[PDB]
């Protein structure tokens, strides 16, 4: 407590947190030193301290994690949260970060239920902005949707695997409703292009 | 002319047909198989296009026509052809097919980790229920792909190794070479283990042989059998490096390492991902701490090695020890995108 107290006053918190860690030691890291980490942003410090220790780097990654994700460190967030198995942070981050195919195989391994309702939405933001082909298949992956895929795949300007998934459907139709439509409007401004 | 008669019937419709009829056979003898595909799809030849389009690799559409009227042959063109494309790394495009037509769990998801896809592998066991994979596809394939790159990451160091000094001719090895006859001077590939192989030497990158110093006809299809014949007869009667000796291999010392990093960066981004699902996240940071290294060794030693100054046709400045010899452009590669649980 003594090292501990000068360190903290003299603003060398890192050494400050490595005494602190001694005195519960033999426990669980109760919330003075949750605190100072959070306070101190002392998180690869207050890691590293117990990079061995996973009884505490449980706790460790929790507060990490839930920092991470309050601080816009999706990604990393996200894979700490599965790593300590919160499922619902994990999904919100995934699904946040434009994951999509861990969120659809997630969705589709553990809760079912959701699968009508995200997959789509995702389907929805990642046309938004110039991303096609990865929501172009997911209406096909479990929604069985031709129509709705192959307007991807001409809109992309992906003619022949337009046509090819027109056909694998055996959709003689869509060649002249989806195909022959985009791939005319398609040429037509790549012409004036 | 054939080129002026085809020409003539951009207008017309039954003589574009009838110059289709007689110049398709010609046209695909010419060269550009794509031609030959087009030509059997204008003229009904709906057999021979599968052929055309196997001939060069082309698939999706052969599946597609063997959908459309053979059914009985879809099969043929698949399963057979998969193996030749499969024997040369093209990993992806054979689990793609096997997969998508032949209805495969076990083997698709093994090549999908093959191919550090491991996301998508789990989520077709997760269309089909399994999880299985984990273990007997997913284990054996992230330890192999782990196994890999702590090989090839590994590579790099020892050729960075023996580049530093001045006088290239200190890799207690290539000094004592002449290089006359049997010089490698083109095909040179490594700097750590240079010339080995008294017999047979053949190096371990053979994707850098230039030729131009294996003969008059710049090629000798291997510089350990070839004259190996270039300027001033290179012997041991020179001096530094700097004098007449190897002067060319200097801008390809680098040019051999840029590109397995570049090519190879997204594959250890996923394997990071991968292998730190399995709740180690250590080997992550072995990955972080090795790709770091190399990147902060080779980029450091780098930093010794300047233009060229003046291009010049023939090597200049002889005394190697003070006139600058191992000059090299400066690379540009940068480093990994940066994570933080793995810190």
Wanted: proline share 2%.
């Amino acid at each position: 407590r003594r090292k501990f107290l000068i360190d903290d006053y003299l603003g060398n918190y890192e050494k400050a947190l490595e005494h602190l860690s001694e005195i519960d030691k033999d426990g669980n890291v109760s919330e003075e030193v949750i605190d100072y980490v959070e306070s101190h942003d002392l998180y690869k410090h207050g890691l590293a301290l117990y990079r061995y220790d996973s009884e505490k780097q449980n706790v460790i990654y929790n507060i990490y994690a839930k920092h991470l994700s309050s601080n816009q460190m999706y990604t990393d967030a996200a894979v700490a949260y599965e790593m300590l198995g919160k499922l619902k942070e994990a999904m919100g981050a995934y699904q946040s970060a434009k994951r999509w195919r861990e969120a659809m195989s997630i969705a589709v391994q553990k809760f079912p239920e959701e699968v009508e309702s995200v997959a789509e939405e995702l389907i929805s933001s990642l046309t938004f902005e110039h991303r096609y082909v990865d929501a172009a298949d997911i209406q096909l992956e479990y929604l069985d949707n031709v129509k709705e895929a192959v307007a991807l795949y001409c809109k992309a300007y992906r003619y022949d695997i337009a046509s090819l998934v027109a056909i694998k459907a055996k959709k003689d139709e869509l060649l002249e409703e989806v195909v022959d439509p985009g791939l005319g409007e398609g040429f037509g401004i790549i012409a004036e292009l | 002319l054939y080129k002026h008669g085809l020409a003539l019937y951009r207008y017309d419709s039954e003589k574009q047909n009838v110059i289709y009829n007689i110049y398709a056979k010609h046209l695909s003898s010419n060269q550009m198989y794509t031609d030959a595909a087009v030509a059997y799809e204008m003229l009904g030849k709906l057999k021979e296009a599968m052929g055309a389009y196997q001939s060069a690799k082309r698939w999706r559409e052969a599946m597609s026509i063997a959908v459309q009227k053979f059914p009985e042959e879809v099969e043929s063109v698949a399963e057979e052809l998969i193996s030749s494309l499969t024997f040369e790394h093209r990993y992806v495009d054979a689990a793609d097919i096997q997969l998508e037509y032949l209805d495969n769990v076990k083997e698709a998801v093994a090549l999908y980790c093959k191919a550090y896809r491991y996301d998508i592998a789990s989520l077709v066991a997760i269309k089909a229920k399994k999880d299985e994979l984990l273990e007997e596809v997913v284990d054996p394939g992230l330890g192999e792909g782990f196994g890999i790159i702590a090989e090839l990451l590994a590579d790099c160091k020892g050729q960075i190794n023996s580049q530093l000094r001045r006088l290239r001719e200190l890799r207690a090895k290539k000094e004592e070479n002449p290089y006359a006859f049997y010089g490698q001077e083109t095909e040179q590939a490594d700097d750590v283990s240079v010339a080995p192989s008294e017999t047979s030497t053949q190096e371990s990158f053979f994707t850098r042989y230039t030729g131009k110093t294996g003969g008059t006809a710049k090629t000798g299809a291997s510089r350990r059998t070839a004259k190996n014949k270039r300027r001033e007869e290179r012997k041991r009667a020179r001096g530094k490096k700097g004098t007449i000796y190897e002067e060319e291999y200097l801008v390809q010392s680098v040019g051999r390492l840029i590109e397995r990093l570049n090519q190879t960066k997204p594959d250890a981004v996923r394997v990071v991902e991968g292998l730190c699902r399995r709740n180690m996240r250590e080997q992550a940071h072995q990955i972080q701490k090795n790709f770091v290294e190399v990147l902060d060794l080779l980029k450091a030693n780098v930093k010794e090695i300047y233009s060229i100054s003046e291009k010049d046709r023939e090597r200049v400045n002889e005394n190697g020890e003070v006139y600058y010899i191992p000059e090299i452009p400066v690379p540009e590669i940068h480093d990994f995108p940066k994570s933080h649980i793995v810190d």
